[PDB]
Design a protein around this ligand. Structure first.
Ligand SMILES: [Mg+2]
Ligand SMILES: [Mg+2]
Ligand SMILES: [Mg+2]
Ligand SMILES: [Mg+2]
Lengths: 97, 107, 155, 250, 51, 107
C-alpha cells in the first residue's frame, strides 16, 4: 500500500533558542566595523569552500589542489576519477555548443 | 509597578483654551495674534509643549508623527482625533446587530 | 440521529424568530414558543429534573380552524362533491403523513420539544396544528386561511 | 534637565530632520525625558521592500554550506563485471549491477559534495538595506531611542514588565554602542531572557531587526549609525581595500 | 461598374493613409508599464491580523 | 460521467413557487480565525458584508465562530435537511460574497 496509518509525533520548533535568536548578527562586520574583517570570515566549513562558489567540476579541481595531499588513497582515486568524468561531460557533451 | 493603562482617548471640550494656557506658559505671557501660526522649529519649546500635553491628557504624539507637528495648529488638529481601544469582538458585538446574526469567540 | 438542538451552532431564540420570518408571518413570539412545547416533554422534563404550558389549547384551535377552513375552500371549489367526499378529502389533507411531510420541510421538528427523537408523527402533527393556532391568534382568520392555502391545499 | 540632540553630520537643503522621543530604562514612567533629531537620509528614506528582501535573502543564504552528498554509480562498491551476456538469455541487458536502475545502485543526479552558496551583494546595497530597515521601524512606531541601557536593578522580570507597560511587544532587540562598555544591569537581565536580546552596534543587521518586534537604540549608537551609513554615499570608488590606510578614513 | 478607372484614382487615398498612421502610432507605443508604490506596500496586508 | 454517477428528476421542495416563495437556506455557519492568512479574506467579509447580508435575508440564521483553524469554511443547511460544506479558504471578499449569494438562492 505505502501510506502511514497514524499521525507522526508532533514536532515543536523552538524559534527562540540562542542560535535562532542571534542568527545573522555580525553580517555587517565590514560596514559597521571600519572594514577590519570581511563577512566571509564568518564562514566556517571546508578549507576549499570558505568564501568561494563554483560548479561541481570547479569544486573538485579546488579540493584536489588544496587538500589533495592530505586525503585518503581511495578517496583521492575517486576524486581523480570524478574530475576525469566531469571534464568529458562539460567539454564534449550537451545541447549547446 | 503601576497597572497598564488604556489606549482609549476622548478629546475634551475645552481643548482650545487648554492649549491657549500651555502655549502662553511656554512661549511667555506676551502672545502675538494668530497664535495657531506659531512655529515649533525650536526643539526645546516643542519638547516642553508636548510634554505638558502628554502628561495631563494621557495621550502622547508617537515618534512617527512628531516631525509632522510643525506648527501649533498641527498639535491642535492632532488632539481632536479620538482613539477608541477595544478588541474586534467587542466592536462587532455592539455594532447594531441584526437578531439573526450570532458571533462567538473561542480565544 | 440526535436532535439539532443537541448539536453545535444552535440558539433556539434566533431560530424561532427566523421561523416567523421564513413564512413572512408576523407571529407573536411568546405564543409560537408555547406552540412548540409538548405535554410529553414536560412530563419527561419533570422526571429528569427530579434527580410552562401545554400545546393543548393552541393545537385544538388550530385543528378545528383548519378543518372548517379546508371545507370552506373545498365546498367553494367543488360544489357537486358530497359531504362525505369532502370529509375524506379534508381528512387526507389533515392526515398524519402529509401534514408531517410539510412539518418536516418547514423545520417544525427542529424546534419541537419532545421526549423522543426522531419525533413520533402524532406529536409532530399536534405541534403543526399548534403553530396554525398561534398564527390564528396572531394575525386573525384571513392571514391563517392564506397560510393553509399556501401549505395544505398545495398537497 | 531635558535631553536634546541635534544632527552633527550635514543635512541636504530640501530635506528636514525627523524627531524621536527619548526615554530611559531607569523608571516605568520615565518616557519623554528628551527629544532627538535624526538624520532624514538614514531614518526617513523611501520604503523599499524589495531591498529588504534582497538583503535578507543574502543574509540567510551566503553563509550556508550544504553537507549532503550521495555516491554515484562509479563510487558504489563492486559492479565491475557484466552480470550476464547481452544476447543469450531472455533478460534485459545490463553492464553493471550498480547502475541507477538497479536496487542498491548509485544516484543518477544527486547532491554532490560540500556545496557553497556564497555570494556578495554590493556594499551600497547592504548599506541601503540597513537604512530602509531603520526607517521602517520608526514609521511603524517600533523604534525607541534611549539615553542609556541602565537598569535600576538586574532582576530580569523588571525588564519584561516594563516592555509590557510600554507596549513594546513580545520581542525586543537592545543595541548598545560597544560590547565592553555595556552596563552590568542590562547584561545580567538579558542573559536569562529568551525574547530580549542584547547586541553591540557592529552586530546590527536586517534579519534581527525584522525578527524582533521592537528595536531599541541608545543616543551613542544613533550618532554612530548615522556616521557610517551616511558615509557610504558621498564616498569615492576605492583604489584598494578600505582596511588599508587612507588620508581620512578611520 | 459605377466610377471609371479615372474617377476612382486617389478617391480614397487620404483615408487609406491616415489609417496607416493609426497602425504606426500603436506600433511605436509599446513600452514597459508604470510601477506603483500602492501595490508594493499592499503585500504587507497578507499578515493582516484581526487582533 | 452520466452512467458513472447518480441521477434525479427535476423538482422543488413542497411546490415552492406555487403559493409563496420560501427561501430554502435556513442556517449558515462561518468558521474563521483571528490570525492566519487563510481566514484573511473571510475576516473582512465579517467586517462589512455579514451584517447587511443578514439584514437582506432574515430567514437565514448566521453563526460566526471565530476559533483557530487552518481552513475557514461555511456550512449551509437547508429546510429539507441537506448540508453543504464549502471551504472559503484563501478567497477575496468579492469571490466569498459570490459564494454566499450562490448558496442563498438555491434549494
Ligand atoms: Mg568501477
Ligand atoms: Mg559498459
Ligand atoms: Mg552490456
Ligand atoms: Mg546506495
Amino acid at each position: 500500500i505505502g501510506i502511514r496509518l497514524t499521525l507522526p509525533p508532533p514536532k515543536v520548533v523552538d524559534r527562540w533558542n540562542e542560535k535562532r535568536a542571534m542568527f545573522g548578527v555580525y553580517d555587517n562586520i565590514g560596514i559597521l566595523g571600519n572594514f577590519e574583517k570581511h563577512p566571509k570570515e564568518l564562514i566556517r566549513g571546508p578549507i576549499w569552500l570558505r568564501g568561494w562558489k563554483g560548479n561541481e567540476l570547479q569544486r573538485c579541481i579546488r579540493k584536489r589542489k588544496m587538500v589533495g595531499s592530505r586525503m585518503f588513497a581511495d578517496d583521492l582515486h575517486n576524486l581523480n576519477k570524478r574530475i576525469r568524468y566531469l571534464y568529458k561531460h562539460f567539454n564534449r557533451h550537451g545541447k549547446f555548443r | 509597578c503601576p497597572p497598564l493603562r488604556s489606549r482609549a482617548y476622548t478629546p475634551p471640550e475645552d481643548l482650545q483654551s487648554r492649549l491657549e494656557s500651555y502655549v502662553k506658559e511656554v512661549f511667555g505671557s506676551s502672545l502675538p495674534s494668530n497664535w495657531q501660526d506659531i512655529s515649533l522649529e525650536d526643539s526645546r519649546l516643542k519638547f516642553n509643549l508636548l510634554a505638558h500635553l502628554a502628561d495631563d491628557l494621557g495621550h502622547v504624539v508617537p515618534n512617527s508623527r512628531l516631525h509632522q507637528m510643525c506648527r501649533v495648529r498641527d498639535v491642535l488638529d492632532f488632539y481632536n482625533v479620538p482613539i477608541q481601544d477595544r478588541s474586534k469582538f467587542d466592536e462587532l458585538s455592539a455594532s447594531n446587530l441584526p437578531p439573526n446574526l450570532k458571533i462567538t469567540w473561542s480565544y | 440521529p440526535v436532535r439539532r438542538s443537541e448539536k453545535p451552532n444552535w440558539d433556539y431564540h434566533a431560530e424561532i424568530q427566523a421561523f416567523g420570518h421564513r413564512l413572512q408571518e408576523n407571529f407573536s413570539l411568546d405564543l409560537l414558543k408555547t406552540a412548540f412545547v409538548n405535554s410529553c416533554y414536560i412530563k419527561s422534563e419533570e422526571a429528569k429534573r427530579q434527580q410552562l404550558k401545554s400545546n393543548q389549547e393552541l393545537s385544538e384551535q388550530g385543528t378545528s380552524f383548519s378543518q372548517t377552513c379546508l371545507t370552506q375552500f373545498l365546498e367553494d371549489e367543488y360544489p357537486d362533491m358530497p359531504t362525505e367526499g369532502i370529509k375524506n378529502l379534508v381528512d387526507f389533507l389533515t392526515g398524519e403523513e402529509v401534514v408531517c411531510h410539510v412539518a418536516r420541510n418547514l423545520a417544525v421538528e427542529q424546534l419541537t420539544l419532545s421526549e423522543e427523537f426522531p419525533v413520533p408523527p402524532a406529536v409532530l402533527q399536534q405541534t403543526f396544528f399548534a403553530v396554525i393556532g398561534a398564527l390564528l391568534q396572531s394575525s386573525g382568520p384571513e392571514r391563517t386561511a392564506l397560510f393553509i392555502r399556501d401549505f395544505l391545499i398545495t398537497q | 534637565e531635558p535631553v536634546l540632540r541635534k544632527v552633527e553630520l550635514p543635512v541636504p537643503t530640501h530635506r528636514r530632520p525627523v524627531q524621536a522621543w527619548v526615554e530611559s530604562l531607569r523608571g516605568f514612567e520615565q518616557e519623554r525625558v528628551g527629544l532627538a533629531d535624526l538624520h532624514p537620509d538614514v531614518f526617513a528614506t523611501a520604503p523599499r521592500l524589495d531591498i529588504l528582501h534582497q538583503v535578507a535573502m543574502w543574509q540567510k543564504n551566503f553563509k550556508r554550506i550544504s553537507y549532503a552528498k550521495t555516491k554515484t554509480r562509479a563510487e558504489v562498491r563492486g559492479g565491475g563485471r557484466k552480470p550476464w551476456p547481452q544476447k543469450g538469455t531472455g533478460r534485459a541487458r545490463h553492464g553493471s549491477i550498480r547502475s541507477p536502475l538497479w536496487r542498491g545502485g548509485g544516484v543518477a543526479h544527486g547532491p554532490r559534495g560540500p556545496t557553497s552558496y556564497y555570494y556578495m551583494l554590493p556594499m551600497k546595497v547592504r548599506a541601503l538595506g540597513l537604512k530602509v530597515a531603520l526607517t521602517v521601524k520608526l514609521a511603524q512606531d517600533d523604534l525607541h531611542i534611549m539615553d542609556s541601557l541602565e537598569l535600576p536593578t538586574g532582576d530580569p522580570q523588571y525588564l519584561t514588565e516594563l516592555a509590557h507597560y510600554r507596549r513594546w511587544g513580545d520581542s525586543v532587540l537592545l543595541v548598545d554602542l560597544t560590547h565592553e562598555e555595556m552596563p552590568q544591569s542590562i547584561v545580567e537581565a538579558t542573559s536569562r531572557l529568551k525574547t530580549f536580546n542584547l547586541i553591540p552596534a557592529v552586530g546590527l543587521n536586517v534579519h534581527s531587526m525584522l525578527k524582533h518586534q521592537t528595536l531599541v537604540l541608545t543616543l551613542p549608537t544613533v550618532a554612530f549609525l548615522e556616521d557610517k551609513l551616511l558615509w557610504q554615499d558621498s564616498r569615492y570608488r576605492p583604489l584598494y581595500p578600505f582596511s588599508l590606510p587612507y588620508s581620512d578614513f578611520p | 461598374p459605377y466610377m471609371t478607372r479615372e474617377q476612382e484614382r486617389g478617391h480614397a487615398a487620404v483615408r487609406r493613409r491616415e489609417a496607416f498612421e493609426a497602425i504606426k502610432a500603436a506600433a511605436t507605443s509599446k513600452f514597459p508599464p508604470h510601477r506603483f508604490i500602492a501595490d508594493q506596500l499592499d503585500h504587507l496586508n497578507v499578515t493582516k491580523k484581526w487582533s | 460521467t452520466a452512467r458513472g454517477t447518480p441521477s434525479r428528476f427535476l423538482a422543488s421542495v413542497l411546490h415552492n413557487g406555487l403559493g409563496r416563495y420560501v427561501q430554502q437556506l435556513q442556517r449558515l455557519s462561518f468558521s474563521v480565525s483571528r490570525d492566519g492568512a487563510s481566514s484573511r479574506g473571510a475576516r473582512e467579509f465579517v467586517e462589512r458584508e455579514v451584517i447587511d447580508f443578514a439584514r437582506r435575508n432574515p430567514g437565514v440564521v448566521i453563526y460566526v465562530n471565530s476559533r483557530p483553524c487552518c481552513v475557514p469554511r461555511v456550512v449551509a443547511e437547508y429546510l429539507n435537511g441537506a448540508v453543504r460544506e464549502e471551504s472559503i479558504h484563501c478567497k477575496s471578499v468579492e469571490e466569498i460574497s459570490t459564494l454566499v449569494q450562490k448558496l442563498a438562492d438555491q434549494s
